[PDB]
């Protein structure tokens, strides 16, 4: 049994630095990949990358490399960091965990597979607005 | 979007985005109305504990071909949005969850 | 003597009228009961290193492979400025070019497309600009589709007055006498397979493996392995490719590549391990006897162009270039090695790579263009013998 | 003289670029075409 719960700011003022904490109860850290998932209203999902055992990590190219996922192993808790956020970053806002999935196609010595990742254990919400007011 | 709600008992068929162009590997979700997307399908076909045997998916002849998400037996619990993961070896990468539904 | 040879060919073939390239149709049809006349207590003595049948088969393969590629497309209208990107894959070997070409009225212009393969491109000096590999040397010629490169065998016959001897002894070398001649008007099978590195589909010794070169304590002088047992070889091309048909000129169509529908893999060979391990092993005790002091090792081959260093072969129709560095490892002192670890997998695998322009026979002025093949490609060939 | 230095346009091995070319070659090769003798 593991349980999420996100706790952050709830609302801030644009071009400053943001942290929004996901609480993690069921398991230490260091056995999961983690992850942070952001809704726009109305769009689509969207992934802004991961975090692994191995400090593995890539952000979002489209996020411009203004991220920094933070961990917060002896409290049990799964942190973010983000400067100079844009009022197009006002997402409803979700922490999940992250599995390992390999994918072969032909001969694996020559390099011809890939990895691809589910996420099946999923957070509980919260929402951050960047307005001025 | 396309809306399929017909009354309960028929089978439904919910269609993805991009031609294939290569091997997938597509994911699939369960976002229902003020709720958290929950995970259905991956690898294309399998299904996780928790999930009954109505949903079905499409294999890897892919190749210029549409993914599609098959419920049969439509029931109560069956109305949600549903999304749809992206990969493959030929077209680069994916940041979005596709198409919304 | 001296004297001039025509082929025979029998009637297994002649039911098409086709012309592959090796003519077949001026083949005279060979003999159902071949006349073979054991010889008496003679004693010939036959020498390997001066023969002339092999010069004549020499400049009769090289004639024949001119017949054919004479009436066929010129390619001196290609020879442009070719543009290039990369296939659009994740984020190579076969590069997107594209090229201005007059039509067919020389009067208009028009821009093409086409891939194919790096190893046909030279660079030419930011957008990256270039040109196609030998056409500032020679002149390129397409080969015709419906025409085939399948070895068929050639028997070899003498003219009426003449007579060809035959060595039927089980262990005979190259340069010396023999005991037990045979006589007969034709000769054995022999499949016209060009091929480096490797002997494909041959002819095997009986209950040993033969060693032959002329002088072997002279290092430069080539040797000549032949086994008692067949190696097989599993090599494929897995790429479901189309074909364009670009027009140039009255009645001259190119025919290029088109797209690739799929994925993009390499050109893998496949050779078994233990089997391969016992070959290997068993001619290395033949060695030890011209050489009894020394270990002996087997090095890989010497930088250079990928047609000499490599494996190179026609497989239906392409020709393969794999390298043979995981074959030549070893080291052996006392016919013992620990260079196979003895675990992990079976099936040494190698890579390939295509190559469409070819210049066998190092031609300074003639090139050919083999037009590509439609779906996928498997070989099975049968190696009997190999070149040290 | 008996002797020309010409010189001459000529489209190369590769049919998209223009070089220009020079050789001495001898009268009785020649014939004027039509100031610059241009023949
Ligand atoms: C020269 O030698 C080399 C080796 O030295 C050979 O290379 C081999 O090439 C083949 C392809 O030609 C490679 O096969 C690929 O392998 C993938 C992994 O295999 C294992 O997958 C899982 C483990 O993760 C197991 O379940 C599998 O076992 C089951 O299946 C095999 C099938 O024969 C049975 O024999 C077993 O008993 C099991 O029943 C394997 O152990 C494999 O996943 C992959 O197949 C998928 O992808 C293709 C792509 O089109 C699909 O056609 C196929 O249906 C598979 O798709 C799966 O997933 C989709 C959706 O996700 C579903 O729709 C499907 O139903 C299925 O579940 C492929 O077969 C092999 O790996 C490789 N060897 C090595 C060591 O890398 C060369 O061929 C050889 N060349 C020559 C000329 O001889
Ligand atoms: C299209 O092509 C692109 C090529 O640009 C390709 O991108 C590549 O993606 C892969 C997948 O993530 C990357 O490979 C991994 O990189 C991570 C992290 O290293 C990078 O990031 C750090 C900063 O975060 C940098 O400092 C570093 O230099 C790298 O840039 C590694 O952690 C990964 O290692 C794992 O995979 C190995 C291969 O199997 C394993 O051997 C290794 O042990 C790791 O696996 C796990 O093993 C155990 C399983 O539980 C576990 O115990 C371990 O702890 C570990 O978690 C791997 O190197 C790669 O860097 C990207 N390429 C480039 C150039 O950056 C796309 O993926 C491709 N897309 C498609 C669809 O084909
Ligand atoms: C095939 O032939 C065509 C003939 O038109 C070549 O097109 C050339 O394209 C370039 C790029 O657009 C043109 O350059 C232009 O230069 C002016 C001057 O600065 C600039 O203002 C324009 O915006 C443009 O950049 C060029 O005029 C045009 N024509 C020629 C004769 O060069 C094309 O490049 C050829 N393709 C190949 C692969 O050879
Ligand atoms: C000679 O040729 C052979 C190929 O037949 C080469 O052997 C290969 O060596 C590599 C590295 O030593 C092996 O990779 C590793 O194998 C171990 C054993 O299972 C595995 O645990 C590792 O993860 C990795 O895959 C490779 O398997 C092996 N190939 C074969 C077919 O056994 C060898 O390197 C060549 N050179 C010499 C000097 O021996
Ligand atoms: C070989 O081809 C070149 C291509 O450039 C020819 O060059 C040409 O040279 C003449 C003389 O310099 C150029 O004429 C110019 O005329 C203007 C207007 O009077 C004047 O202001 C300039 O100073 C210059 O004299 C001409 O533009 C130039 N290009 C072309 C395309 O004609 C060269 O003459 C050719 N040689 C032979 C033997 O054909
Ligand atoms: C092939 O084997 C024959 C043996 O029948 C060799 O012939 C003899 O070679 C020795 C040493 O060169 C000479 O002294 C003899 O005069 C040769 N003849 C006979 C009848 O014994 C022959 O040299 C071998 N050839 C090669 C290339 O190894
Ligand atoms: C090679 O490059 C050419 C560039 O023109 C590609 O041709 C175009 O591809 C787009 C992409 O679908 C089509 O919409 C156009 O109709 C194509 N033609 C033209 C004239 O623009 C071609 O697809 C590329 N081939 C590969 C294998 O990448
Ligand atoms: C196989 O041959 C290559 C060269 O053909 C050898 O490579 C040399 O290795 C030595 C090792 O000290 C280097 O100093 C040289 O620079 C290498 N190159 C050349 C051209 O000599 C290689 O050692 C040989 N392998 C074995 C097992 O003998
Ligand atoms: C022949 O194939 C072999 C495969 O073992 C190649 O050898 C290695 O190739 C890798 C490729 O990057 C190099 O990094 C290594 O330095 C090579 N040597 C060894 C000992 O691993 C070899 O390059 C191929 N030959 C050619 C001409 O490409
Ligand atoms: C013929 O005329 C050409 C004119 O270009 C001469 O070539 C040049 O000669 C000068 C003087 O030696 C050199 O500096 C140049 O490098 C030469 N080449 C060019 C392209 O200008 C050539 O020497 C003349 N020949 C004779 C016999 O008079
Ligand atoms: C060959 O030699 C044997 C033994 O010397 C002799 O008897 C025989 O007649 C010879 N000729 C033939 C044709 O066997
Ligand atoms: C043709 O071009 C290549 C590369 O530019 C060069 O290696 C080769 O020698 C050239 N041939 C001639 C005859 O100049
Ligand atoms: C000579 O070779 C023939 C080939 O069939 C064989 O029948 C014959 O027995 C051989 N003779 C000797 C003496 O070995
Ligand atoms: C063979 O090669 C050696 C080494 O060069 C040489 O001394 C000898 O004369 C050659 N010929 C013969 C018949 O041994
Ligand atoms: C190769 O592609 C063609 C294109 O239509 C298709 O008809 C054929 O079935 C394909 N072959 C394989 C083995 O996929
Ligand atoms: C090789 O020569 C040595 C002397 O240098 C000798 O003792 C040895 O027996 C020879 N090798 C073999 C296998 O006879
Ligand atoms: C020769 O063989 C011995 C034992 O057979 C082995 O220990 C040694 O490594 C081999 N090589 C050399 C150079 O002595
Ligand atoms: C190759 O053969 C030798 C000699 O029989 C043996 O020692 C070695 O284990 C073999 N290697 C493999 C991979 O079978
Ligand atoms: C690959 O190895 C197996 C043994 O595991 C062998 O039976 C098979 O023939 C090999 N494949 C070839 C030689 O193509």
């Known amino acids: 049994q593991v349980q999420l719960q996100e706790s952050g700011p709830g609302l801030v003022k644009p071009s400053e630095t943001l942290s929004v904490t996901c609480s993690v109860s069921?398991?230490?850290?260091?056995?999961?990949?983690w992850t942070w998932i952001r809704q726009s209203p109305g769009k689509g999902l969207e992934w802004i990358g991961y975090?692994?055992?191995?400090?593995?990590?890539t952000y979002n190219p489209s996020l411009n490399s203004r991220v920094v996922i933070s961990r917060d192993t002896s409290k049990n808790q799964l942190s973010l960091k983000l400067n100079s956020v844009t009022p197009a970053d006002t997402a409803v806002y979700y922490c999940?965990?992250?599995?390992?999935?390999?994918?072969?196609?032909?001969?694996?010595?020559?390099?011809?597979?890939?990895?691809?990742?589910?996420?099946?254990?999923w957070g509980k919400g919260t929402t951050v607005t960047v307005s001025s007011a | 979007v396309r809306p399929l709600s017909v009354a309960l008992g028929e089978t439904a068929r919910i269609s993805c985005g991009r031609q294939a162009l290569g091997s997938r590997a597509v994911q699939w979700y369960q976002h229902r109305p003020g709720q958290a997307p929950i995970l259905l399908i991956y690898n294309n076909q399998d299904r996780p504990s928790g999930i009954p045997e109505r949903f079905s998916g499409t294999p890897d002849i892919n190749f210029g071909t549409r993914a599609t998400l098959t419920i049969s037996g439509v029931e109560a619990g069956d109305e949600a949005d549903y999304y749809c993961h992206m990969w493959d070896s030929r077209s680069g990468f994916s940041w979005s969850f596709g198409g919304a539904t | 003597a001296t004297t001039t040879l025509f082929c025979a060919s029998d009637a297994k073939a002649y039911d098409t009228e086709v012309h592959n390239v090796w003519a077949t149709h001026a083949c005279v049809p060979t003999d159902p009961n071949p006349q073979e006349i054991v010889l008496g207590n003679v004693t010939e003595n036959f020498n390997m290193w001066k023969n002339n049948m092999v010069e004549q088969m020499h400049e009769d393969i090289i004639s024949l492979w001119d017949q054919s590629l004479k009436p066929c497309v010129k390619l001196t209208p290609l020879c442009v400025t070719l543009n290039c990107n990369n296939v659009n894959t994740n984020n190579g070997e076969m590069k997107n070019c594209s090229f201005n070409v007059t039509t067919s009225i020389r009067d208009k212009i028009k821009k093409e497309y086409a891939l194919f393969y790096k190893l046909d491109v030279v660079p030419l000096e930011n957008i990256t600009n270039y040109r196609l590999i030998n056409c500032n040397t020679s002149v390129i010629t397409q080969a015709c589709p419906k025409v085939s490169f399948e070895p068929i065998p050639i028997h070899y016959c003498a003219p009426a007055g003449f007579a060809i001897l035959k060595c039927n002894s089980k262990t005979f070398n190259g340069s010396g006498p023999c005991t037990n001649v045979s006589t007969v008007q034709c000769t054995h099978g022999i499949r016209p397979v060009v091929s480096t590195q490797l002997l494909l589909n041959g002819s095997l010794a009986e209950e040993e493996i033969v060693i032959r070169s002329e002088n072997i304590t002279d290092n430069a002088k080539t040797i000549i392995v032949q086994l008692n047992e067949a190696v097989e070889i599993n090599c494929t091309r897995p790429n479901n490719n189309t074909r364009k048909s670009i027009h140039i000129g009255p009645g001259r169509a190119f025919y290029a590549t088109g797209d690739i529908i799929g994925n993009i893999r390499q050109a893998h060979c496949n050779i078994s391990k233990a089997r391969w391990n016992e070959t290997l092993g068993q001619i290395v005790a033949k060695l030890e006897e011209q050489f009894p002091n020394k270990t002996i090792i087997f090095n890989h081959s010497s930088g250079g162009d990928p047609e000499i260093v490599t494996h190179s072969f026609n497989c239906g129709g392409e020709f393969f270039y794999c390298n043979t560095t995981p074959l030549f490892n070893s080291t052996w002192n006392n016919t013992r090695t620990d260079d196979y670890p003895t675990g992990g997998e079976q099936n040494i695998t190698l890579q390939c790579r295509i190559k469409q322009i070819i210049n066998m026979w190092q031609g300074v002025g003639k090139a050919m263009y083999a037009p590509p093949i439609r779906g996928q490609i498997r070989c099975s060939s049968n190696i009997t013998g190999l070149l040290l | 003289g008996e002797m020309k230095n010409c010189s001459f346009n000529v489209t190369t091995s590769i049919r998209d670029k223009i070089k220009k070319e020079y050789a001495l070659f001898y009268k009785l090769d020649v014939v004027p075409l039509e100031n610059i003798t241009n023949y």
């Open positions: 069921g398991d230490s850290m260091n056995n999961y990949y």
């Open positions: 975090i692994s055992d191995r400090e593995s990590a």
């Open positions: 999940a965990t992250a599995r390992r999935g390999q994918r072969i196609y032909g001969v694996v010595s020559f390099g011809e597979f890939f990895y691809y990742y589910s996420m099946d254990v």
